[PDB]
Each structure stands twice: as C-alpha cells, then as structure tokens.
Design a protein around this ligand. Structure first.
Ligand SMILES: CC(C)n1c(S(=O)(=O)O)nc2ccccc21
Ligand SMILES: CC(C)n1c(S(=O)(=O)O)nc2ccccc21
Ligand SMILES: CC(C)n1c(S(=O)(=O)O)nc2ccccc21
Ligand SMILES: CC(C)n1c(S(=O)(=O)O)nc2ccccc21
Lengths: 383, 380, 372, 380
C-alpha cells in the first residue's frame, strides 16, 4: 500500500462518491471564486454579499434541507465537507455560510409552518434572500420581548454581533413571549424593510473581517401571526440552531488547519538554511508530524459524528467534543505554523490565525464545551 | 435525542463486528479475572507468572491473526487491537509479554517460515505451551551465523529481551555472509544462554533478560528461508507497534476512569472536586484524546484488514497513543492528593509503565522523524 | 569571556564567601553521607535517625537560629543553599531537614518562652532531639484547659519525623476560641506516633501520625507569644522558602544526569547530543534552572534585609516546584535512573499543599484585591 | 514591615543605581509622552515618522553605551536595557528603530571603524540628525570590487529597517585579498547607484519603516571601509548587541500585555462577579507575573556581567530566547483572555509584533542549538 501524507487514513475512500462530488464542487467553487477575493476582502473588511447566490446556484446552502423545500437533500457528512472547503479559504466566509444554513434554514425547516417553510426556504436555498440570526444581546435571561397585539406581535429590543444583519432580508429573531402561566422564548421571522427594524454594521473587527456583522435593532416592530414559529418553545429553538452550526464549524476549523499545515510544509521545503532545506531540521519535522496527526484524527472524529447524525444515533454532547477539539487544535496548528514562517503569500497563515483566535473565543473564554463534557461525565455543573 | 455515552461517545462498541466484540469481552473477562488480582504483587516484587501464556493461549488470545490452519484463532487486526487494549487496561507489562508472542515470534515464523517451521512452532506458540522471544538488540549488528556441517553456528549477544529467561523458542537476527537472517533456536541448545535482568523501573510485571550465543548450533531446517535484510525484523516491529497503539489507549482509559471516579469521591470546601472548572477541562481533554485515538486505531485496523495501510500510518497511531496516554497518566497523577494511599495510585503503576513504553524505541522521537521524512522526502 | 554551561550567570560570583563555604559544606555532607544511602533507603523505605545527628554536627539544622541557642547564625541565603544541596540528593532528606529547621526550631525560637527556647533549641540544633510538626488533620484537634495545664484530644496525619521525634510542636484550638501552639515530648501518656508505610514518593523520609488521647501538656508548654493563623503560617512560609531552593537542586541533578546520558549515547550514527529535539530540551532546563536561582537568591537577599513580603515566597516556591517537576519529566523522557526517584519525589512535593494551586490564588488575590 | 509590590515583586527598582533609574524614568516619560499617542494610528496605516530619531537622540536614547567622546551618553548596558524595555512597552516597532541605530550602526562603527569614521558619523547618529540602517540579509552575493579611489559595490539587501529614511548605510559585502572575506562598508544617502525602496503591507512591526538596499556599482571611497574587522565577527558583534536589548524590550511588551489583561479582568464583571474572581484567570495572572519577574532578574544580571566584562555571548542566547518566547506566550495568553472582536486589544498589536520578533532570527530555534552545542560540544 502507498502512503498518502496528505490523507493518511484515506478519508477520500471513506466517503460515498455522492459525498465526494459535493466536496469537489465546494472545493472548485471556493478555490475558483473565494480564494482570489480573500486577501483584500479580509484586509479591508470589505462587505461582500456575492457568496450567497454563488453558493446557492450550485446547491451549497442549507445542504441538509430536503428537495421538497428547495434544498439539495444532502447528508450531514456532505454539510461537513462543504464547510471544510469554505474555511480552507477563510473562516469569515464559512461563518456567513453557517448562518444561512444552520441558523436560518434549519429553524424554519424544523419549527416553521408549511406556509413559512414553502415561502422562505426556496429563496434562502438559492441565496436570493440572505438570512441572519437574532439571539445574542449586549447583556434564558434575554431582554428582547414580543408583546401581543391586534393581528400578531410587537417586538422590541436589540441583538448584537449578528453576522449578516447589515445585508439580511430574513431575520430569525428570538424573543420572550408571556403566554399565560410563564414567559417562554419564541422565534420570529421578520423581513427587511419592516418598520422599527434597523441593522447597522459593526466596523473594526480584529478577526473574521471577511464577514459582515451588525446589530438587529427592534423598536416596536410588528410581526403578523403568520410569522411566529409555531412548533417550538424555549431553549430547544435557539439551541438546535447552535448545535447544527457547531457541527459545521467542527468540520470547517479542520479546513483552516489543513491550509496552515500545507503552507508550513511547502514553506520549509522551499526555504534553505545553514546548508540544507528547513524541512531537514528535526524540530520542524516534529511540528509537521504533530499537525498531520491532529488533523488526521480530528477528521475521523467529525466523519464519525456525521455518520452518527445521519443514523440518528448522535447525542448533542458529541458535538461539544468535536467543535472544541477542531477549534482548539486548529488554533494550536495555526500558531505552530505561524512560528515556522519568516518574512512579514505565505501570510494567509496570519489571516487564518486571527480568524481562529476569534472563532475560539466566539462562545466565550470559559471553555463552555469543556463544562458541557465535564457535567456529562460527572452530573455536576461547574460554578 | 439519542443517548450520550460518556465512556464511549462515538460508540466504538457499535462499529465492531460481533466476533470482534466477543474477542474483546473474552479478553476483558480474562484480564480482569486473572491479571488484575496478580498485578499489584507482580509489579512490586517484579514477578511474572509464566502461566499467563498458557492461560491466554487457552482462550485464543496469542497470535490472534495467525490462521486456524496453523493453530491460531484466525481473527482480524481489529481483534488483535481489542485484545492488547484489554490486557494493557490492567498492565503494560502483561501486554508486552503478549506483544512478543504474537508480533515478535508468531508473525515472523508465519510470514517468513517454511511449511515445516510453521507446522511445528505456531500451534504450540498459539496455545502458549512454548514461550517465544525476539533477539534483535545488541549493546551495525555483530551477532553472526557461520555455515557448519548440517546448519549454522551463531556467536553474539542480545540485550533487553522480553521473555528471554523463560523462552522455549528464540527468533534471533544475525548476519550470514552478507545479510540479516532470522534463526529459530530452542531452549536447551548447547551454546544458548538466557540470563535474567532484574531491577526495572517500569514494566516490572514482565520478565526481561539476555540471549548469549557461543557457537550455538542451528540446523539448516531452522533458518527462516523467505526473508533477508531489515524487512524481517521491521515487519515484526511494525506489527508489535500496531498492538501497542491500541494497548496504550487501554492504560489511558484506566487512568481516566480512576481520575474521574476520584474527583467524584472527593471534596474541597464542601464542593465535590468535579465542581471545579479546571478538573472538568482535564476530564474533557482525557475523554477527547482517547475517543479520537480509538477512531484512529480502529480505522488503521480496518485498513490493515483490507490491505490498504502503509507502514507510516502505524507511526502516527503508536506515537499518538503512547504520547497521549503518558500525558493522561500524568494529568491523572497530578489530580491525586496524598502519597500512595488507595488504589487510585494504580495511576502510579500505569504512569511508570508508560514512561518506559514511551522511551523503549529510544530518546530520538523516531516516529516524528519517519513522518517528517514521509511529508518532506528528507532524512532528518 | 568564558561561558559556564552549568552556571551561566555565575551565581558563584554573586555569593559571599560565608555563603559559598556553607553551600560546599552541605554538598560534601550530602554527597558523602546521603548519596550512598538513598537508593536502599528509598527502596525499602528505611528509617535512619542518625542523619539528624550528622547534620546537627556540621550545623545544618536551624541554620538561621542564633548561636545563643546552638544554631550557626547563618543568613537566609545560606539556609537556601543548604536545602538545595540536600535535595540535590533526595527530597525526602530535605523534608526531614525542613521540619527540624522551619517547622520546629523556628516556632519555638519565634514564639516560645525563654525557658522553652533554652531547653529545646540546643538539642534540636545538634540533632540529639528530633522534632515534628502537627498541623494537618485527616481544625478539630483541641486543648481542654485542665489542672496544671491542658488535655489534647485529636489526630494529625502525614507528619514527617513523627515516629522518631522527641519534640512535637502541635497546633490545637483553645478557648479564652483560637489556634495555639503546644510542645509535647515523646513518652507523654495518650501520645502515639504510628508510622505510615507504603508511600509512592518521599520514601526515604519517615512519616507518621500523631494520635492524642487526652494527652497532658503542662502550662509552661504552650507557646505564649502567638495565637491564630500567624503561628502555623510563619512556619509554612519559612519551610516554603527552603523548598523553593531545594526543588532546584533536584532539577539540577535531573538536568546533569540527562545531559551526561545524551553525551554518552550513540543512536543511528551519532551521539544523542546531535539531536535538535534533545538540545532544545537541554536549553530549556538550563534556562528555567538559571532563572529560578536568580529568583530564590534575590528573595533570600530581600528576606535578610527585611524588604521581603510573604507573597514573594508563593512566587518562588510555585515556580521552583513546578519547573522542577517539568524538568524531571523532560529528563525522564530522554532516558532509554536516580531521575525516576527525583520524579516521584517531586510529584508528591508538587501536590503536598493541595491540587488547587494555592500559591497562584494568593498571587491572584495580591494582584487584584479580589479573592477567588 | 515589608509590603508587597505586585507590579515589581523583587523590587527591581531598588537594584538599580540612581544613574540607571534616571535613565529609565526619562525613557518612560518620552515613550509614554510621545510614542503612546502616535502608536495606534501609526500601526494601522504604517505611518513613517522620521522625527522620532531626533526626539530620541535629543535625550540620549540613541547609542546608549557609546562614549561621550563621540556624542553618546556613555551609559552602561543595564541602562541600554531599561531604555529598550520602556520603548517596547509602547511598541516593538519603535524599539526596532532604536535597536538599529544603537546596536547595528553605532556599535559597528565605534567598535570597528577608524578614528575618522567615528568622529564623522557617531555624533550625528547619537543626536538622530543622521538615521542609520544595517544591510546584512539578502533576497552572500553582495560583492565589493577594488577599483581606483576605493570600492565598487553590487548586490541587494532585503528587510532592512530604516533604509528608506536612512542617511548612513552600514553594508556588509564580500571582498577578496591575500582570502575571500566579509568586510563592512559605510555608504551615505544620495550616493549614485544606491537606492532604498520601501516595503509596505507588513503584518507585524507596522510602526517601523523597512525597505531595501539596492547597490548598482555603488562607489565606496577607500576611507569608508571599516578597517578593524573581517569575517563573521563583524555582523555577529552587532547582532549580539541587538539581542541583548531585545531581551529587555520583549519583557516591556510582556508587561504591557500583562497590565492590560489584569486591568481588563478587574474592569469586567461576569455572573455578578469581577472576572478577576475566577481561578483560571488568577493562575494566568500568576504565570505572567512569575515569568516577567524572573526574566527581569536574568537580563539585569546579564547586563551587570556585560558592564564588568564577565559575560560570554551564549548568555545572550539564553535571555533573548527566553524574553521573546515568554513574551509571545504572555501575549497569546492575554489575547485569549480578551472576549470580543474589535483598546485592551492593544494586546493584538503587541501579539502580531512579537510573532514577527520571534521569527526574525529564523524559522527554527537557532539559540536553542547554540546552547545545545555549548552544553555538549556537539553541533546541529
Ligand atoms: C456562524 C458564527 C455566528 N459562529 C461562530 S464563528 O463566528 O464562525 O466563530 N461560532 C459559532 C458558534 C455557534 C454558533 C454560531 C457561530
Ligand atoms: C513488546 C515490547 C518489547 N515493546 C515495547 S514495550 O516494552 O511494551 O514498551 N515497545 C515496543 C516497540 C516495538 C517493538 C516491541 C516493543
Ligand atoms: C517539609 C514538608 C513537610 N513539606 C513539603 S514536602 O513534603 O517536602 O513536599 N512541602 C511543604 C510545604 C509547606 C510546609 C512543609 C512542606
Ligand atoms: C533590530 C531588528 C532589525 N531586529 C529584530 S526585530 O525585528 O526587532 O525583531 N530582531 C533582531 C535580531 C537580531 C538583530 C536585529 C533584530
């Protein structure tokens, strides 16, 4: 048997050709269209809404959404593969993509009415309408509220750090509704142009600059009864979305790690020092072996998670394992690779690195997935 | 949703065939039943009960990949892995004894032996009636075979040989002019001696000694006819490494299980230790690395069964398993308070064992360098 | 001009003649009398109280205690250099010494009556009397005021020296409710000190319990001049200072053994010293060791001036012990075996004060005014 | 009754002479007064502010150890270190501009130049009226050929700090005579065949201007070749001096990152509790403090030894490597403590600078190998 250094366990062979064609398409697309924009799209934080129709055309948005509602009907593994190819170029692009697929199309599909499903999904799937997701507030114990009024509801509040909001057409806002006996979290579809709805940008981000982020500002915004999500109440709504998004990020972070690895490898092959090429140094070799190992193992982890999700056998806690691992290992590898590079084109690594610094702290600095896993091992929440 | 299994998050148990699961279960019943009760005294006094060979052999745990034709159990590589894991869960020293039998003695006889050699040695090695060892290392090989009427005369020495003082069968690598050839010798050969080595830091539960050859006669029929060069020895080392890749994860799991149960049992300001944020991160890391390590060795095993596994993959897995296992053992050690009291310090036994296992192939991080060359095309 | 790999910053040239003599004296004792014993003593966890008389003789017990009471009247830097030389052989021996000097002699001297100071210090200095320190419990140990003195019930655990001690500095609670120091003597009825055996590390030191069953202490054997936390804490702080030095002696041994091992080894074609991974590990041991020593030296100089706040001991004890453990592990992972001993000792040393990084929390508080 | 100083636990302040403390104070006032207000926008848009050199020289911050005879302040090595620490505390890019003037231009001329060269160049470099650069690294091809009048120079230098704004160029080229050896030449701005195009779009050290040196048959008179050095000792003497100051500077950067993370966690509240109330945050602050404090003792001691001449070059390898390595770790630790994406992100600037600082001397651990060789007597 021959050894494939770039794919030691032959992931390629563990994929259905079905899944493999999706990867190839995603790769062709991201390399063809996103890679030549990335460097200056990142450097100048340039707003860019192209991705959506481009990805929509070739069926890369909401990949697990059935054909019935305009989705491509792909499986969890294929969603994984797509995320990996986009983030191989940049995490900012992957993020915009995560929002559309996991944070908008998933809740609508999962908790929407048939009318909501048949109305919104097709336009999201093709990228005609761009979505955003309204949960996080400036600080469940959320402030944004919906008061019941003649017709439907009246929403007031703010959401912050919302990817896609300054270019969104469909807003999936989460807010509290006082029903009868207690106050529960509910989901709302708002459309752009609705009065009371602002979404100004956030500028000056240190990382994920290639993605556009903003606020969602709601000042007595009216939502008719037909635009509340009927089939969910409470945490289950927002959490289903975050679980799906994290699964994709678990694949996507390994794409960026691979990019850093391949660059570090090619660099030390091309450069010379005190006689030999840099690749001849044992310290360099160890670093390259550590990168290969963690990526190879990480990929088996996410592949297996996706297989389990398609079977319906994967509990939510497994996502914590892979998301945390993929992100933390990708950050370590991005740093390892940074520290191998001289000379202030290779510096796609510095970009990946600052992206991953943000990705690793996006869900906070208290290692929330460690805590989910610790409680799942012991039954005890850490306080 | 689906149920979360903290102890088997990716449900390894369900990626196994039922014969593989049966082998695992039998290996578990044996180790826990027969090795766990011996291990504390065996280690402390550096005793090995050679009856372990006959016991493991009874159950069909020796040379698991050797076909039934030659008296083996005819199992696949995943099963070999599962067995090493259950044995090492108890003690690396016991796993080492088995690693020698199966990978260092039965494998080369099977791959490189004549029909006569395979028929004579393998059934007895498989049942553990005959105990084997592997003579490669020497304190650039000076042990030499010379042609003499009706065979060969071997002179030289091998050092740090596991099983050697209790071996019935010896696979020795020696130069024959000028290639490396493998020879099968039997205890009682005039010229052959196997003095024991005592006072080990780790792997105290396995026995180690030398092989000393002073014109030891080997008849013609006992030279391994179908191999010459480094490939003979290296095929064996590669097989051994594969099972250690699984085994080290067994010991890792024990350390993790001990550490978890310890922090569950203990208190600190009335809060149980598991309330501690730092403890949770540590348990999460232990769980993550074992879970991923296991997916790695399983996939390698499946590839080796289908013949699609290059030898470099073995370097990835053995290095990772041994490396992460040692870090886990050290993580679990430093979580423990006190100084020896309670079998929570069974972590101390696993720890010293893994410190030997992680340096047995030398201080040079050999596998990082194999993998480095494999990536770059450059010997470093 | 000339580089000293074993002393890059020439600590030798930053020490007074006074201090260099004391160092080389503790070195000669340790290497001549302790090194030949340690391997068997560790193996069999064998007790040997003769070590107390041998150190007393050369004046290594209570090195900062005034000549007036039998101590050698040395300075804090000298106490450190001694700890480092003793632990260079074995942490167990250093621990026996830490107890005599910082947990027994320091408190009698610091908080004891003139009567107490004269009766006990002289014989502790010479090692004729052996002392132990009863603070840690399995606080519930207490002194009932009774006729003539006090009756102590309770139990102390993991007490170094206790099964060979003559003098016990025991800490109990008494109502007036506060923490007081008591002095007990071997033989007193209701006082036993059974041995603890089976240790994984520090096997060369003898540890035991102190079991008090209505043990009598006369009124003259309470420490008059301290109450509350400051009592035990004064002792711990001095012991921790010595350990900050000591741990670096063990680290140095590990580094020297690892270095010599790789000089002597051939692998593939060359020596192990040819390997860059090995050289990087060696560069890391040298760095951390050299920096740690500048830290403990400076701390010592500050303590001798009276400019040293107690928080600085937390910095150095944490760092020396943490780095020493790391270096013992790095050394171990280079060896294909006194290192293995130093390693298990330091694994105990590093968790002796708990597994919750108490010194990190002390320093976090000191930086922020906010308790964790 | 001794009080603890969290920000100076070993009272470094009290280990300085008055001399040295006054220098530190002046460097501190200048950097905080004049550099801090510029740094954010200068970093962002890669501002060239050449006026900084005159500002620095005015107070005696350029070429600290150069004697008064030639316009230098005649300070000791410890003072050089204190200056570097205070400048880098604001930004590594400003420290870099200073390192070049002091260690890479004034040191080579003072140490290896003729009397004529020293009196001509040093006074104007000390005041900052003339700005220097140091041309070693290439994209050694750079050749000086003996002609009538002096020397013709051809070649290119790359990544040369200050070069687009330099008045004085210290360029190292190879010359054959009697054999083929590294010599030092001094060129000046406006010399025909000398150009120095600026590099822009840097990831780190964006506050320092860098560029090229392109020599197309550039004429250097006889009087402008450095006459008292040949071979590697020339450049090496400069690099070593530069490293000593970087060893102090990097620790200033670490201190800023530490001070920002501390203030951040005191200012922030989470869960009705200051962030500083968390155990992990306190460990991180303790590690930052420990490593900074210990590093400072090292570079203090190294400077003292250098002032009395007892310091071998290898000690500079230890401290430079430590300071830069620990600074990066501390910078990364603080960065990871900050939750957000877009002033306490002053840490982001220090971080990207330090990532360039830690790779400037090679993709691999050049100093570790110096210390390895030094410990063992064996080369890698
Ligand atoms: C897709 C974006 C918003 N995102 C990111 S990130 O911005 O790509 O890092 N991390 C997430 C975790 C959970 C849900 C969404 C997340
Ligand atoms: C089985 C024993 C000898 N062994 C060991 S060990 O002693 O169990 O660690 N490591 C090995 C690597 C290759 C081949 C054999 C090995
Ligand atoms: C001297 C022994 C008991 N000891 C030790 S140890 O057992 O040598 O590690 N660590 C200590 C910390 C504080 C006080 C005493 C300590
Ligand atoms: C002063 C600049 C050029 N510099 C730097 S840096 O750019 O400030 O990191 N590192 C150096 C190492 C040796 C010599 C000079 C160095």
């Amino acid at each position: 048997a021959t050894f494939h250094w770039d794919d030691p366990l032959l992931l390629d062979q563990q994929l259905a050709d079905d899944e493999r064609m999706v990867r190839d398409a995603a790769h062709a697309y991201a390399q063809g269209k996103l890679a030549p924009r990335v460097t200056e799209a990142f450097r100048h934080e340039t707003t860019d809404a192209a991705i959506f129709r481009e990805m929509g055309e070739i069926g890369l948005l909401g990949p697990t959404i059935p054909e019935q509602y305009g989705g491509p009907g792909l499986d969890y593994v294929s969603y994984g593969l797509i995320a990996r190819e986009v983030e191989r170029v940049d995490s900012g692009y992957r993020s915009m993509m995560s929002v559309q697929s996991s944070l908008v199309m998933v809740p609508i599909f999962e908790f929407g009415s048939d009318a909501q499903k048949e109305k919104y999904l097709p336009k999201l799937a093709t990228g005609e309408w761009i979505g955003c997701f309204g949960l996080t507030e400036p600080n469940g114990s959320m402030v944004t509220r919906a008061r019941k009024v003649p017709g439907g509801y009246s929403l007031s509040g703010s959401k912050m750090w919302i990817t896609n909001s300054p270019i969104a057409d469909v807003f999936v806002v989460w807010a509290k509704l006082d029903e009868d006996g207690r106050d529960e979290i509910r989901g709302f579809i708002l459309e752009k142009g609705c009065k009371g709805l602002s979404a100004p940008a956030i500028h000056g981000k240190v990382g994920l600059r290639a993605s556009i982020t903003g606020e969602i500002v709601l000042d007595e915004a009216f939502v008719p009864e037909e635009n509340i999500l009927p089939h969910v109440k409470g945490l289950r709504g927002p959490f289903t979305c975050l679980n799906s998004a994290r699964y994709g990020i678990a694949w996507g972070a390994l794409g960026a790690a691979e990019s850093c690895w391949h660059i570090a490898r090619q660099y030390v092959l091309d450069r010379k020092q005190f006689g030999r090429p840099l690749a001849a140094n044992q310290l360099i070799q160890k670093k390259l072996a550590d990168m290969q190992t963690e990526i190879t193992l990480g990929l088996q982890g996410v592949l297996r998670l996706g297989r389990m999700k398609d079977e319906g056998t994967a509990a939510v806690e497994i996502t914590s394992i892979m998301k945390r691992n993929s992100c933390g290992k990708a950050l370590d590898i991005a740093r390892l690779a940074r520290d191998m590079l001289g000379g202030n084109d290779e510096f796609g690594v510095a970009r990946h690195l600052v992206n991953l610094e943000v990705v690793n702290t996006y869900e906070g600095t208290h290692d929330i997935h460690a805590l989910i896993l610790g409680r799942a091992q012991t039954g005890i929440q850490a306080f």
